[PDB]
Write a protein that binds this ligand. Structure first.
Ligand SMILES: CC(C)=CCC/C(C)=C/CC[C@H](C)CCOP(=O)(O)OP(=O)(O)O
Ligand SMILES: CC(C)=CCC/C(C)=C/CC[C@H](C)CCOP(=O)(O)OP(=O)(O)O
Ligand SMILES: [Mg+2]
Ligand SMILES: [Mg+2]
Ligand SMILES: [Mg+2]
Ligand SMILES: [Mg+2]
Lengths: 291, 306
Protein backbone atom coordinates (compact mmCIF):
# COMPACT_ATOMS: atom_id res chain seq x y z
CA UNK A 1 0.00 0.00 0.00
CA UNK A 2 2.84 2.43 1.06
CA UNK A 3 4.68 1.66 -2.26
CA UNK A 4 1.71 3.26 -4.20
CA UNK A 5 2.58 6.78 -2.80
CA UNK A 6 4.47 7.73 -6.04
CA UNK A 7 5.02 10.97 -8.11
CA UNK A 8 6.33 11.54 -11.69
CA UNK A 9 8.79 14.14 -10.22
CA UNK A 10 11.48 13.83 -7.47
CA UNK A 11 12.54 16.05 -4.53
CA UNK A 12 15.85 17.33 -3.07
CA UNK A 13 17.32 17.94 0.45
CA UNK A 14 19.28 20.99 1.78
CA UNK A 15 22.99 20.16 2.33
CA UNK A 16 22.44 21.77 5.84
CA UNK A 17 19.73 19.18 6.83
CA UNK A 18 21.42 17.68 9.99
CA UNK A 19 22.76 21.07 11.35
CA UNK A 20 19.13 22.44 11.07
CA UNK A 21 17.55 19.29 12.68
CA UNK A 22 20.03 19.63 15.65
CA UNK A 23 19.29 23.43 15.96
CA UNK A 24 15.49 22.59 15.91
CA UNK A 25 15.99 20.10 18.84
CA UNK A 26 18.13 22.87 20.52
CA UNK A 27 15.36 25.50 19.83
CA UNK A 28 12.57 23.18 21.21
CA UNK A 29 14.72 22.63 24.39
CA UNK A 30 15.33 26.43 24.84
CA UNK A 31 11.53 27.20 24.74
CA UNK A 32 10.76 24.05 26.85
CA UNK A 33 8.80 22.00 24.23
CA UNK A 34 13.35 10.41 17.17
CA UNK A 35 11.52 13.52 15.81
CA UNK A 36 13.67 14.59 12.77
CA UNK A 37 11.42 17.67 12.04
CA UNK A 38 14.47 19.51 10.54
CA UNK A 39 14.83 16.65 7.96
CA UNK A 40 11.22 17.38 6.79
CA UNK A 41 12.03 21.15 6.51
CA UNK A 42 15.38 20.39 4.72
CA UNK A 43 13.44 18.40 2.02
CA UNK A 44 10.48 20.89 1.85
CA UNK A 45 12.76 23.98 1.26
CA UNK A 46 15.93 22.36 -0.20
CA UNK A 47 17.36 25.52 -1.93
CA UNK A 48 16.63 27.82 1.10
CA UNK A 49 19.54 29.71 2.81
CA UNK A 50 20.42 28.37 6.33
CA UNK A 51 18.74 31.34 8.17
CA UNK A 52 15.36 30.92 6.32
CA UNK A 53 15.49 27.04 6.48
CA UNK A 54 15.94 27.26 10.32
CA UNK A 55 12.75 29.44 10.69
CA UNK A 56 10.84 26.89 8.50
CA UNK A 57 12.22 23.91 10.55
CA UNK A 58 11.28 25.63 13.89
CA UNK A 59 7.76 26.45 12.47
CA UNK A 60 7.28 22.76 11.37
CA UNK A 61 8.48 21.60 14.87
CA UNK A 62 5.91 24.01 16.45
CA UNK A 63 3.02 22.45 14.40
CA UNK A 64 4.02 18.87 15.50
CA UNK A 65 4.44 20.03 19.18
CA UNK A 66 1.00 21.77 18.89
CA UNK A 67 -0.62 18.59 17.36
CA UNK A 68 1.02 16.43 20.14
CA UNK A 69 0.30 18.81 23.13
CA UNK A 70 -3.47 19.17 22.25
CA UNK A 71 -3.98 15.43 23.20
CA UNK A 72 -12.26 20.40 25.41
CA UNK A 73 -13.40 23.33 23.15
CA UNK A 74 -13.51 26.14 25.82
CA UNK A 75 -9.75 25.54 26.58
CA UNK A 76 -8.94 25.42 22.79
CA UNK A 77 -10.89 28.68 21.96
CA UNK A 78 -8.94 30.50 24.78
CA UNK A 79 -5.48 29.32 23.48
CA UNK A 80 -6.22 30.15 19.76
CA UNK A 81 -7.37 33.75 20.66
CA UNK A 82 -3.90 34.56 22.13
CA UNK A 83 -1.82 32.72 19.42
CA UNK A 84 -3.50 35.09 16.86
CA UNK A 85 -2.71 38.16 19.09
CA UNK A 86 0.97 36.93 19.03
CA UNK A 87 0.72 36.42 15.19
CA UNK A 88 -0.64 40.03 14.74
CA UNK A 89 2.13 41.17 17.17
CA UNK A 90 1.04 41.00 20.88
CA UNK A 91 3.98 40.72 23.40
CA UNK A 92 4.22 37.30 25.17
CA UNK A 93 3.32 38.44 28.77
CA UNK A 94 3.80 36.29 31.95
CA UNK A 95 1.63 33.10 32.38
CA UNK A 96 1.69 32.51 28.54
CA UNK A 97 2.14 28.83 27.44
CA UNK A 98 5.61 27.62 26.22
CA UNK A 99 4.06 27.28 22.68
CA UNK A 100 2.90 30.97 22.82
CA UNK A 101 6.52 32.15 23.56
CA UNK A 102 7.83 29.80 20.78
CA UNK A 103 5.23 31.21 18.28
CA UNK A 104 6.24 34.79 19.37
CA UNK A 105 9.90 33.96 18.43
CA UNK A 106 8.85 32.55 14.98
CA UNK A 107 6.68 35.69 14.25
CA UNK A 108 9.62 37.94 15.40
CA UNK A 109 12.13 36.13 13.07
CA UNK A 110 9.63 36.06 10.09
CA UNK A 111 8.95 39.85 10.57
CA UNK A 112 12.74 40.41 9.96
CA UNK A 113 12.47 38.44 6.64
CA UNK A 114 8.97 39.26 5.17
CA UNK A 115 6.76 42.35 4.48
CA UNK A 116 3.49 43.15 6.40
CA UNK A 117 1.55 41.94 3.27
CA UNK A 118 3.16 38.44 3.69
CA UNK A 119 2.65 38.35 7.53
CA UNK A 120 -1.13 39.01 6.95
CA UNK A 121 -1.42 36.10 4.40
CA UNK A 122 0.54 33.72 6.74
CA UNK A 123 -1.61 34.87 9.76
CA UNK A 124 -4.90 34.26 7.84
CA UNK A 125 -3.71 30.72 6.83
CA UNK A 126 -2.81 30.07 10.53
CA UNK A 127 -6.28 31.42 11.65
CA UNK A 128 -8.05 28.98 9.22
CA UNK A 129 -5.82 26.16 10.67
CA UNK A 130 -7.08 27.01 14.24
CA UNK A 131 -10.74 27.29 13.00
CA UNK A 132 -10.44 23.84 11.28
CA UNK A 133 -8.87 22.33 14.49
CA UNK A 134 -11.79 23.67 16.69
CA UNK A 135 -14.24 22.20 14.07
CA UNK A 136 -12.50 18.74 14.19
CA UNK A 137 -12.46 18.91 18.07
CA UNK A 138 -16.29 19.55 18.21
CA UNK A 139 -16.88 16.59 15.78
CA UNK A 140 -14.70 14.34 18.07
CA UNK A 141 -16.54 15.21 21.36
CA UNK A 142 -20.02 15.28 19.67
CA UNK A 143 -19.11 12.00 17.83
CA UNK A 144 -19.93 13.70 14.46
CA UNK A 145 -19.31 11.62 11.27
CA UNK A 146 -18.36 13.95 8.35
CA UNK A 147 -18.68 12.46 4.79
CA UNK A 148 -15.61 12.30 2.43
CA UNK A 149 -16.50 15.64 0.68
CA UNK A 150 -16.78 17.50 4.08
CA UNK A 151 -13.62 15.84 5.56
CA UNK A 152 -11.43 16.60 2.46
CA UNK A 153 -12.69 20.26 2.28
CA UNK A 154 -11.85 20.75 6.04
CA UNK A 155 -8.56 18.74 5.80
CA UNK A 156 -7.11 21.44 3.42
CA UNK A 157 -7.08 23.86 6.45
CA UNK A 158 -6.66 21.41 9.45
CA UNK A 159 -3.19 20.30 8.16
CA UNK A 160 -1.81 23.92 8.01
CA UNK A 161 -0.13 23.06 4.63
CA UNK A 162 -1.12 26.54 3.21
CA UNK A 163 0.84 28.29 6.04
CA UNK A 164 3.88 26.11 5.04
CA UNK A 165 3.34 27.03 1.31
CA UNK A 166 3.59 30.76 2.31
CA UNK A 167 7.24 30.08 3.42
CA UNK A 168 8.06 28.91 -0.19
CA UNK A 169 8.10 32.64 -1.28
CA UNK A 170 10.64 33.46 1.52
CA UNK A 171 12.74 30.26 0.89
CA UNK A 172 12.89 31.06 -2.89
CA UNK A 173 13.15 34.89 -2.30
CA UNK A 174 10.36 35.55 -4.90
CA UNK A 175 7.58 38.22 -4.93
CA UNK A 176 4.27 37.43 -6.75
CA UNK A 177 1.83 40.25 -7.66
CA UNK A 178 -1.74 39.92 -6.19
CA UNK A 179 -3.16 38.92 -9.65
CA UNK A 180 -0.63 36.02 -10.07
CA UNK A 181 -0.81 34.79 -6.40
CA UNK A 182 -4.66 34.50 -6.59
CA UNK A 183 -4.93 33.23 -10.24
CA UNK A 184 -7.41 30.27 -10.42
CA UNK A 185 -4.73 27.81 -11.78
CA UNK A 186 -2.17 28.83 -9.06
CA UNK A 187 -4.93 28.26 -6.40
CA UNK A 188 -5.87 24.89 -8.04
CA UNK A 189 -2.15 23.78 -8.01
CA UNK A 190 -1.93 24.76 -4.26
CA UNK A 191 -5.19 22.80 -3.55
CA UNK A 192 -3.87 19.74 -5.49
CA UNK A 193 -0.47 19.82 -3.66
CA UNK A 194 -2.27 20.25 -0.26
CA UNK A 195 -4.70 17.31 -0.95
CA UNK A 196 -1.75 15.07 -2.11
CA UNK A 197 0.27 15.90 1.09
CA UNK A 198 -2.79 15.36 3.42
CA UNK A 199 -4.00 12.09 1.73
CA UNK A 200 -0.40 10.70 1.69
CA UNK A 201 -0.26 11.48 5.49
CA UNK A 202 -3.74 9.87 6.06
CA UNK A 203 -2.72 6.55 4.34
CA UNK A 204 0.49 6.43 6.52
CA UNK A 205 -1.06 7.67 9.86
CA UNK A 206 -4.44 5.74 9.92
CA UNK A 207 -3.02 3.00 12.27
CA UNK A 208 -1.78 5.76 14.71
CA UNK A 209 -5.15 7.65 14.58
CA UNK A 210 -7.27 4.40 14.95
CA UNK A 211 -5.29 3.52 18.17
CA UNK A 212 -6.11 6.99 19.70
CA UNK A 213 -9.84 6.94 18.66
CA UNK A 214 -9.40 9.64 15.93
CA UNK A 215 -11.48 9.22 12.69
CA UNK A 216 -10.35 12.49 10.92
CA UNK A 217 -8.42 10.44 8.29
CA UNK A 218 -9.38 9.83 4.59
CA UNK A 219 -9.11 5.97 4.93
CA UNK A 220 -11.32 6.02 8.11
CA UNK A 221 -13.91 8.52 6.62
CA UNK A 222 -14.07 6.47 3.31
CA UNK A 223 -14.56 3.25 5.41
CA UNK A 224 -17.57 4.87 7.22
CA UNK A 225 -19.15 6.35 4.01
CA UNK A 226 -18.90 3.18 1.78
CA UNK A 227 -19.47 0.69 4.71
CA UNK A 228 -16.47 -1.25 3.22
CA UNK A 229 -13.33 -3.13 4.49
CA UNK A 230 -10.03 -1.40 5.55
CA UNK A 231 -8.13 -2.70 2.44
CA UNK A 232 -10.88 -1.28 0.09
CA UNK A 233 -10.88 2.05 2.06
CA UNK A 234 -7.02 2.20 1.62
CA UNK A 235 -7.40 1.31 -2.14
CA UNK A 236 -10.04 4.13 -2.55
CA UNK A 237 -7.76 6.63 -0.67
CA UNK A 238 -4.71 5.77 -2.91
CA UNK A 239 -6.95 6.11 -6.07
CA UNK A 240 -7.84 9.70 -4.91
CA UNK A 241 -4.08 10.39 -4.22
CA UNK A 242 -3.17 9.02 -7.73
CA UNK A 243 -5.98 11.13 -9.36
CA UNK A 244 -4.84 14.33 -7.49
CA UNK A 245 -1.18 13.79 -8.68
CA UNK A 246 -2.51 13.45 -12.31
CA UNK A 247 -4.52 16.73 -11.74
CA UNK A 248 -1.43 18.63 -10.36
CA UNK A 249 0.77 17.47 -13.33
CA UNK A 250 -1.96 18.43 -15.92
CA UNK A 251 -2.68 21.92 -14.39
CA UNK A 252 1.11 22.74 -14.26
CA UNK A 253 0.90 23.51 -18.06
CA UNK A 254 -2.31 25.69 -17.64
CA UNK A 255 -0.48 28.64 -15.88
CA UNK A 256 -1.10 31.73 -18.10
CA UNK A 257 1.81 33.82 -19.51
CA UNK A 258 1.79 37.12 -17.49
CA UNK A 259 5.39 38.27 -18.31
CA UNK A 260 9.00 36.89 -18.14
CA UNK A 261 9.67 38.02 -14.50
CA UNK A 262 6.25 36.94 -13.03
CA UNK A 263 6.29 33.53 -14.86
CA UNK A 264 9.94 32.86 -13.72
CA UNK A 265 8.79 33.40 -10.06
CA UNK A 266 5.62 31.26 -10.69
CA UNK A 267 7.80 28.39 -12.12
CA UNK A 268 9.97 28.59 -8.91
CA UNK A 269 6.79 28.61 -6.70
CA UNK A 270 5.27 25.52 -8.49
CA UNK A 271 8.73 23.78 -8.28
CA UNK A 272 8.45 24.62 -4.52
CA UNK A 273 5.01 22.86 -4.36
CA UNK A 274 6.67 19.76 -5.98
CA UNK A 275 9.57 19.89 -3.41
CA UNK A 276 6.91 19.91 -0.60
CA UNK A 277 4.89 16.96 -2.10
CA UNK A 278 8.12 14.82 -2.35
CA UNK A 279 9.42 16.04 1.09
CA UNK A 280 6.15 14.93 2.82
CA UNK A 281 6.29 11.40 1.23
CA UNK A 282 10.12 10.90 1.50
CA UNK A 283 10.14 12.07 5.19
CA UNK A 284 6.91 10.26 6.33
CA UNK A 285 7.99 6.83 4.84
CA UNK A 286 11.07 6.82 7.22
CA UNK A 287 9.52 8.73 10.21
CA UNK A 288 9.26 6.99 13.66
CA UNK A 289 5.85 8.82 13.85
CA UNK A 290 4.13 6.41 11.34
CA UNK A 291 6.08 3.18 12.27
CA UNK B 1 19.48 6.40 26.09
CA UNK B 2 20.10 9.63 24.04
CA UNK B 3 23.92 9.99 23.50
CA UNK B 4 23.71 12.95 20.98
CA UNK B 5 25.11 15.32 23.70
CA UNK B 6 28.16 12.98 24.24
CA UNK B 7 28.95 12.47 20.47
CA UNK B 8 29.95 16.11 19.67
CA UNK B 9 32.45 17.05 16.86
CA UNK B 10 33.92 20.58 16.37
CA UNK B 11 33.22 20.27 12.59
CA UNK B 12 29.90 19.75 10.69
CA UNK B 13 28.77 17.33 7.95
CA UNK B 14 26.72 17.86 4.77
CA UNK B 15 24.30 15.67 2.72
CA UNK B 16 24.07 15.27 -1.10
CA UNK B 17 20.92 17.03 -2.45
CA UNK B 18 20.12 13.70 -4.28
CA UNK B 19 20.05 11.66 -0.98
CA UNK B 20 16.51 10.16 -1.42
CA UNK B 21 16.91 9.47 -5.22
CA UNK B 22 20.22 7.63 -4.38
CA UNK B 23 18.54 5.48 -1.63
CA UNK B 24 15.70 4.50 -4.09
CA UNK B 25 18.37 3.52 -6.73
CA UNK B 26 20.17 1.37 -4.04
CA UNK B 27 16.88 -0.53 -3.27
CA UNK B 28 16.42 -1.23 -7.06
CA UNK B 29 20.09 -2.45 -7.27
CA UNK B 30 19.46 -4.63 -4.12
CA UNK B 31 16.22 -6.06 -5.70
CA UNK B 32 17.99 -6.60 -9.11
CA UNK B 33 20.78 -8.71 -7.42
CA UNK B 34 18.25 -10.47 -5.07
CA UNK B 35 19.79 -9.09 -1.81
CA UNK B 36 16.38 -8.15 -0.20
CA UNK B 37 15.02 -11.05 1.97
CA UNK B 38 11.89 -10.24 4.13
CA UNK B 39 11.01 -3.20 5.65
CA UNK B 40 13.39 -2.62 2.64
CA UNK B 41 11.95 0.97 2.50
CA UNK B 42 13.45 1.86 5.99
CA UNK B 43 17.08 0.57 5.44
CA UNK B 44 18.16 4.11 4.29
CA UNK B 45 21.73 2.92 3.32
CA UNK B 46 21.71 5.65 0.59
CA UNK B 47 21.19 8.34 3.31
CA UNK B 48 24.54 7.30 4.97
CA UNK B 49 26.38 7.43 1.57
CA UNK B 50 24.67 10.81 0.78
CA UNK B 51 26.23 12.20 4.05
CA UNK B 52 29.65 10.40 3.76
CA UNK B 53 30.27 11.68 0.14
CA UNK B 54 28.11 14.86 0.13
CA UNK B 55 29.76 16.59 -2.92
CA UNK B 56 30.14 13.39 -5.08
CA UNK B 57 28.69 13.24 -8.65
CA UNK B 58 25.47 11.10 -8.74
CA UNK B 59 27.25 8.13 -10.48
CA UNK B 60 30.16 7.92 -7.92
CA UNK B 61 27.66 8.52 -5.02
CA UNK B 62 25.53 5.59 -6.40
CA UNK B 63 28.60 3.21 -6.35
CA UNK B 64 29.35 4.37 -2.73
CA UNK B 65 25.64 3.85 -1.73
CA UNK B 66 25.52 0.33 -3.34
CA UNK B 67 28.92 -0.56 -1.68
CA UNK B 68 27.69 0.59 1.80
CA UNK B 69 24.44 -1.41 1.17
CA UNK B 70 26.61 -4.46 0.19
CA UNK B 71 28.60 -4.19 3.49
CA UNK B 72 25.32 -4.07 5.55
CA UNK B 73 23.77 -7.08 3.67
CA UNK B 74 27.09 -9.03 4.20
CA UNK B 75 27.51 -7.83 7.84
CA UNK B 76 23.94 -8.93 8.82
CA UNK B 77 24.72 -12.55 7.68
CA UNK B 78 28.03 -12.57 9.72
CA UNK B 79 26.62 -10.76 12.83
CA UNK B 80 23.10 -12.39 13.00
CA UNK B 81 23.30 -15.77 11.03
CA UNK B 82 25.21 -19.13 11.20
CA UNK B 83 27.96 -18.19 8.64
CA UNK B 84 29.47 -15.82 11.30
CA UNK B 85 29.91 -18.94 13.57
CA UNK B 86 31.26 -21.26 10.76
CA UNK B 87 34.93 -20.48 9.79
CA UNK B 88 34.96 -23.17 6.98
CA UNK B 89 31.82 -21.65 5.29
CA UNK B 90 33.32 -18.11 5.76
CA UNK B 91 36.71 -19.21 4.18
CA UNK B 92 34.76 -20.72 1.19
CA UNK B 93 32.71 -17.48 0.68
CA UNK B 94 35.78 -15.14 1.16
CA UNK B 95 37.76 -17.17 -1.47
CA UNK B 96 34.88 -16.46 -3.97
CA UNK B 97 34.75 -12.71 -3.02
CA UNK B 98 38.60 -12.48 -3.35
CA UNK B 99 38.40 -14.16 -6.84
CA UNK B 100 35.73 -11.52 -7.80
CA UNK B 101 37.90 -8.61 -6.41
CA UNK B 102 40.80 -9.88 -8.65
CA UNK B 103 38.33 -9.66 -11.62
CA UNK B 104 37.05 -13.29 -11.91
CA UNK B 105 33.50 -13.59 -13.43
CA UNK B 106 30.78 -15.02 -11.11
CA UNK B 107 29.72 -18.71 -11.63
CA UNK B 108 26.02 -19.56 -12.40
CA UNK B 109 25.32 -20.55 -8.71
CA UNK B 110 27.61 -18.09 -6.84
CA UNK B 111 25.47 -16.43 -4.08
CA UNK B 112 23.67 -13.05 -4.66
CA UNK B 113 26.41 -11.10 -2.72
CA UNK B 114 29.17 -12.52 -5.05
CA UNK B 115 27.21 -11.31 -8.18
CA UNK B 116 26.61 -7.89 -6.46
CA UNK B 117 30.35 -7.53 -5.50
CA UNK B 118 31.36 -8.29 -9.17
CA UNK B 119 28.97 -5.48 -10.35
CA UNK B 120 30.61 -3.03 -7.86
CA UNK B 121 34.15 -4.21 -8.95
CA UNK B 122 33.20 -3.60 -12.66
CA UNK B 123 31.71 -0.13 -11.88
CA UNK B 124 34.74 0.91 -9.71
CA UNK B 125 37.11 -0.29 -12.54
CA UNK B 126 35.32 2.23 -14.90
CA UNK B 127 36.02 5.10 -12.37
CA UNK B 128 39.41 4.13 -10.78
CA UNK B 129 42.98 3.34 -11.94
CA UNK B 130 44.44 -0.19 -11.30
CA UNK B 131 46.61 1.05 -8.35
CA UNK B 132 43.34 2.20 -6.62
CA UNK B 133 41.59 -1.20 -7.22
CA UNK B 134 44.64 -2.92 -5.57
CA UNK B 135 44.50 -0.56 -2.49
CA UNK B 136 40.66 -1.01 -2.20
CA UNK B 137 40.95 -4.85 -2.70
CA UNK B 138 43.65 -5.12 0.06
CA UNK B 139 41.48 -3.11 2.57
CA UNK B 140 38.51 -5.47 1.72
CA UNK B 141 40.84 -8.55 2.16
CA UNK B 142 41.82 -7.25 5.67
CA UNK B 143 38.03 -6.81 6.36
CA UNK B 144 37.45 -10.54 5.50
CA UNK B 145 40.52 -11.57 7.63
CA UNK B 146 39.18 -9.49 10.61
CA UNK B 147 35.67 -11.10 10.22
CA UNK B 148 37.21 -14.67 10.23
CA UNK B 149 39.10 -13.60 13.44
CA UNK B 150 35.70 -12.44 14.93
CA UNK B 151 34.16 -15.83 13.81
CA UNK B 152 36.93 -17.79 15.69
CA UNK B 153 36.18 -15.61 18.81
CA UNK B 154 32.40 -16.44 18.43
CA UNK B 155 33.27 -20.18 17.92
CA UNK B 156 35.61 -20.29 21.01
CA UNK B 157 33.23 -18.05 23.07
CA UNK B 158 36.30 -15.77 23.55
CA UNK B 159 36.32 -12.00 24.35
CA UNK B 160 39.48 -10.02 23.40
CA UNK B 161 40.93 -7.32 25.76
CA UNK B 162 40.43 -3.60 24.80
CA UNK B 163 43.87 -3.27 23.06
CA UNK B 164 43.26 -6.42 20.89
CA UNK B 165 39.58 -5.54 20.09
CA UNK B 166 40.44 -1.91 19.04
CA UNK B 167 43.40 -3.10 16.88
CA UNK B 168 41.11 -5.67 15.09
CA UNK B 169 38.08 -3.26 14.87
CA UNK B 170 40.04 -0.89 12.50
CA UNK B 171 39.75 -3.74 9.88
CA UNK B 172 36.43 -5.50 10.88
CA UNK B 173 34.38 -2.29 10.18
CA UNK B 174 35.73 -1.95 6.56
CA UNK B 175 36.08 1.87 7.17
CA UNK B 176 39.46 1.98 5.27
CA UNK B 177 37.68 0.52 2.15
CA UNK B 178 35.06 3.35 2.48
CA UNK B 179 37.94 5.92 2.93
CA UNK B 180 39.45 4.71 -0.41
CA UNK B 181 36.20 5.93 -2.14
CA UNK B 182 36.88 9.54 -0.83
CA UNK B 183 39.67 9.86 -3.51
CA UNK B 184 37.15 8.96 -6.30
CA UNK B 185 34.30 11.08 -4.76
CA UNK B 186 36.60 14.20 -4.51
CA UNK B 187 38.49 13.40 -7.81
CA UNK B 188 41.95 13.74 -6.15
CA UNK B 189 45.26 11.86 -6.62
CA UNK B 190 47.77 11.62 -3.71
CA UNK B 191 51.36 10.50 -4.49
CA UNK B 192 52.54 7.33 -2.62
CA UNK B 193 54.77 9.43 -0.23
CA UNK B 194 51.78 11.66 0.84
CA UNK B 195 49.19 8.78 1.01
CA UNK B 196 51.47 6.69 3.35
CA UNK B 197 52.82 9.68 5.42
CA UNK B 198 52.82 8.86 9.21
CA UNK B 199 50.40 11.77 10.06
CA UNK B 200 47.95 10.97 7.15
CA UNK B 201 47.85 7.30 8.43
CA UNK B 202 47.32 8.55 12.05
CA UNK B 203 44.41 10.82 10.84
CA UNK B 204 42.82 7.80 8.99
CA UNK B 205 43.36 5.67 12.17
CA UNK B 206 41.71 8.32 14.44
CA UNK B 207 38.76 8.85 11.98
CA UNK B 208 38.28 5.01 11.77
CA UNK B 209 38.43 4.67 15.63
CA UNK B 210 35.88 7.56 16.04
CA UNK B 211 33.41 5.97 13.51
CA UNK B 212 33.76 2.43 15.05
CA UNK B 213 33.47 3.55 18.72
CA UNK B 214 30.50 5.88 17.91
CA UNK B 215 28.89 2.85 16.16
CA UNK B 216 29.78 0.58 19.17
CA UNK B 217 27.95 2.91 21.66
CA UNK B 218 24.86 3.17 19.35
CA UNK B 219 24.81 -0.58 18.33
CA UNK B 220 25.73 -2.36 21.65
CA UNK B 221 21.99 -3.11 22.35
CA UNK B 222 21.34 -4.99 19.03
CA UNK B 223 24.78 -6.75 19.36
CA UNK B 224 24.10 -7.86 23.01
CA UNK B 225 20.69 -9.20 21.72
CA UNK B 226 22.48 -11.49 19.15
CA UNK B 227 25.18 -12.48 21.75
CA UNK B 228 27.96 -10.61 19.82
CA UNK B 229 30.77 -9.05 21.99
CA UNK B 230 32.80 -7.30 19.19
CA UNK B 231 31.89 -3.90 20.70
CA UNK B 232 34.07 -1.43 22.71
CA UNK B 233 31.34 -1.16 25.44
CA UNK B 234 31.10 -4.98 25.90
CA UNK B 235 34.94 -5.51 25.69
CA UNK B 236 35.56 -2.69 28.31
CA UNK B 237 32.81 -4.29 30.53
CA UNK B 238 34.59 -7.70 30.11
CA UNK B 239 38.10 -6.29 30.96
CA UNK B 240 37.22 -4.02 33.99
CA UNK B 241 34.33 -6.28 35.23
CA UNK B 242 32.24 -3.05 35.65
CA UNK B 243 28.53 -2.04 35.22
CA UNK B 244 27.06 -1.41 31.71
CA UNK B 245 26.70 2.37 32.45
CA UNK B 246 30.42 2.50 33.54
CA UNK B 247 31.41 0.62 30.30
CA UNK B 248 29.38 3.14 28.17
CA UNK B 249 31.03 6.10 30.04
CA UNK B 250 34.54 4.58 29.41
CA UNK B 251 33.68 4.02 25.67
CA UNK B 252 32.37 7.64 25.31
CA UNK B 253 35.57 8.89 27.11
CA UNK B 254 37.75 7.01 24.52
CA UNK B 255 35.56 8.45 21.67
CA UNK B 256 36.05 12.04 23.07
CA UNK B 257 39.87 11.50 23.38
CA UNK B 258 40.06 10.19 19.76
CA UNK B 259 38.11 13.26 18.44
CA UNK B 260 40.69 15.49 20.27
CA UNK B 261 43.58 13.44 18.70
CA UNK B 262 42.09 13.75 15.15
CA UNK B 263 41.51 17.58 15.48
CA UNK B 264 45.04 18.27 16.95
CA UNK B 265 46.83 16.00 14.37
CA UNK B 266 45.07 17.90 11.47
CA UNK B 267 47.62 20.77 12.03
CA UNK B 268 50.67 18.35 11.90
CA UNK B 269 50.39 17.49 8.12
CA UNK B 270 53.72 18.54 6.49
CA UNK B 271 53.81 20.96 3.49
CA UNK B 272 54.80 18.83 0.41
CA UNK B 273 53.73 21.25 -2.40
CA UNK B 274 50.62 23.37 -3.35
CA UNK B 275 48.95 20.56 -5.42
CA UNK B 276 49.50 17.64 -2.93
CA UNK B 277 48.55 19.76 0.18
CA UNK B 278 45.32 20.96 -1.59
CA UNK B 279 44.50 17.25 -2.33
CA UNK B 280 45.37 16.24 1.32
CA UNK B 281 43.18 19.07 2.80
CA UNK B 282 40.30 17.84 0.51
CA UNK B 283 40.94 14.22 1.76
CA UNK B 284 41.06 15.23 5.50
CA UNK B 285 37.79 17.23 4.93
CA UNK B 286 36.47 13.90 3.46
CA UNK B 287 37.38 12.03 6.71
CA UNK B 288 35.41 14.77 8.63
CA UNK B 289 32.36 14.26 6.30
CA UNK B 290 32.56 10.47 7.08
CA UNK B 291 32.91 11.05 10.89
CA UNK B 292 29.77 13.32 10.83
CA UNK B 293 27.89 11.04 8.32
CA UNK B 294 28.35 7.98 10.63
CA UNK B 295 26.97 9.82 13.73
CA UNK B 296 24.22 11.90 11.94
CA UNK B 297 22.78 8.81 10.10
CA UNK B 298 23.16 6.38 13.10
CA UNK B 299 21.29 8.73 15.55
CA UNK B 300 18.07 8.52 13.37
CA UNK B 301 18.54 5.15 11.50
CA UNK B 302 15.92 2.37 12.15
CA UNK B 303 18.96 -0.04 12.29
CA UNK B 304 19.95 1.20 15.85
CA UNK B 305 16.36 1.91 17.15
CA UNK B 306 15.07 -0.43 19.93
C1 LIG C 1 1.24 18.53 12.31
C2 LIG C 1 1.04 19.60 11.28
C3 LIG C 1 -0.26 20.34 11.38
C4 LIG C 1 1.95 19.89 10.35
C5 LIG C 1 3.33 19.35 10.19
C6 LIG C 1 3.97 19.80 8.89
C7 LIG C 1 3.24 19.29 7.68
C8 LIG C 1 2.46 20.32 6.92
C9 LIG C 1 3.28 18.00 7.36
C10 LIG C 1 2.44 17.25 6.38
C11 LIG C 1 1.61 16.12 7.03
C12 LIG C 1 0.18 16.47 7.45
C13 LIG C 1 -0.43 17.58 6.61
C14 LIG C 1 0.09 16.80 8.94
C15 LIG C 1 -1.30 17.20 9.39
O1 LIG C 1 -1.47 16.91 10.81
P1 LIG C 1 -1.89 15.43 11.29
O2 LIG C 1 -2.48 15.56 12.66
O3 LIG C 1 -2.69 14.74 10.24
O4 LIG C 1 -0.45 14.75 11.40
P2 LIG C 1 0.07 13.33 11.97
O5 LIG C 1 -0.54 12.27 11.09
O6 LIG C 1 1.58 13.39 11.87
O7 LIG C 1 -0.41 13.25 13.41
C1 LIG D 1 28.41 -2.97 7.77
C2 LIG D 1 29.77 -2.40 7.49
C3 LIG D 1 30.91 -3.35 7.73
C4 LIG D 1 29.96 -1.16 7.06
C5 LIG D 1 28.92 -0.17 6.60
C6 LIG D 1 29.51 1.20 6.33
C7 LIG D 1 30.24 1.77 7.51
C8 LIG D 1 31.73 1.89 7.33
C9 LIG D 1 29.59 2.14 8.61
C10 LIG D 1 30.14 2.78 9.85
C11 LIG D 1 29.78 2.02 11.15
C12 LIG D 1 30.48 0.68 11.40
C13 LIG D 1 31.92 0.69 10.90
C14 LIG D 1 29.67 -0.48 10.82
C15 LIG D 1 30.30 -1.86 10.76
O1 LIG D 1 30.41 -2.44 12.09
P1 LIG D 1 29.17 -3.23 12.78
O2 LIG D 1 29.10 -4.66 12.34
O3 LIG D 1 29.28 -2.98 14.24
O4 LIG D 1 27.87 -2.47 12.21
P2 LIG D 1 26.39 -2.40 12.86
O5 LIG D 1 26.55 -1.95 14.30
O6 LIG D 1 25.61 -1.41 12.03
O7 LIG D 1 25.85 -3.80 12.74
MG1 LIG E 1 -2.60 12.13 10.02
MG1 LIG F 1 -3.46 13.69 14.38
MG1 LIG G 1 26.94 -5.66 12.53
MG1 LIG H 1 28.14 -2.10 15.67
Amino acid sequence: YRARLVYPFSGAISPHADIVDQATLAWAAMFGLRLQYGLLAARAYPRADREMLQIAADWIAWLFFMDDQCDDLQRMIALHERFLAILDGATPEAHDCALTYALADLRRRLALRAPDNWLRRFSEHVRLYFTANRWETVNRQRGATPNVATYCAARLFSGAVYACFDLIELAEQIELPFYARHHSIVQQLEQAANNIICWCNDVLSYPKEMQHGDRHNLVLVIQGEHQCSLPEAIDRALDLHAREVATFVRKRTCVPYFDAAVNTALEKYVTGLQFWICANRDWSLTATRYA
